[PDB]
Amino acid sequence: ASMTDQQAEARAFLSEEMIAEFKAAFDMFDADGGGDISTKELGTVMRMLGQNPTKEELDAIIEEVDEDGSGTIDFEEFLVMMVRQMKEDA
């Protein structure tokens, strides 16, 4: 597919409640609730260890989902990311 229908199959398993629950934990990626993961804040959640991060280190995760080009993702498209390899079976 492309990306739209992508969140569709991933939403079927994420009942309207399964998403409203992650919304709260969605503030962990951003700062206090910027409502975005863009390499701006993303490079930190992963580089929070304290290491100079590479420009391609935070962009390598952006091309895995952020295909539009903006170079950022929200809690919406971020869900399908974990709904890919489900231990259930996949």
Curated annotation (Swiss-Prot):
> Which residues form each disulfide bond in the chain?
none
Q: Which residues carry this modification: Blocked amino end (Ala)?
A: A1
**Domain EF-hand: where?**
17-52, 53-88
Q: Does the keyword Calcium apply?
A: yes
Remarks, miscellaneous = Skeletal muscle troponin C binds four calcium ions.
Highest taxon, organism lineage? Eukaryota
Known function: Troponin is the central regulatory protein of striated muscle contraction. Tn consists of three components: Tn-I which is the inhibitor of actomyosin ATPase, Tn-T which contains the binding site for tropomyosin and Tn-C. The binding of calcium to Tn-C abolishes the inhibitory action of Tn on actin filaments.
UniProt keyword list: Calcium, Metal-binding, Muscle protein, Repeat
Q: Which family does it belong to?
A: Belongs to the troponin C family.
Put simply, this protein is called Troponin C, skeletal muscle
Q: Which gene encodes it?
A: TNNC2
Q: Which GO terms describe its molecular function?
A: calcium ion binding
Q: Name one GO biological process term.
A: skeletal muscle contraction
Query: Cellular component GO terms, alphabetically?
Result: troponin complex
Q: Where does Ca(2+) 2 bind?
A: D66, D68, S70, T72, E77
Annotated Ca(2+) 1 binding lies at: D30, D32, D36, E41
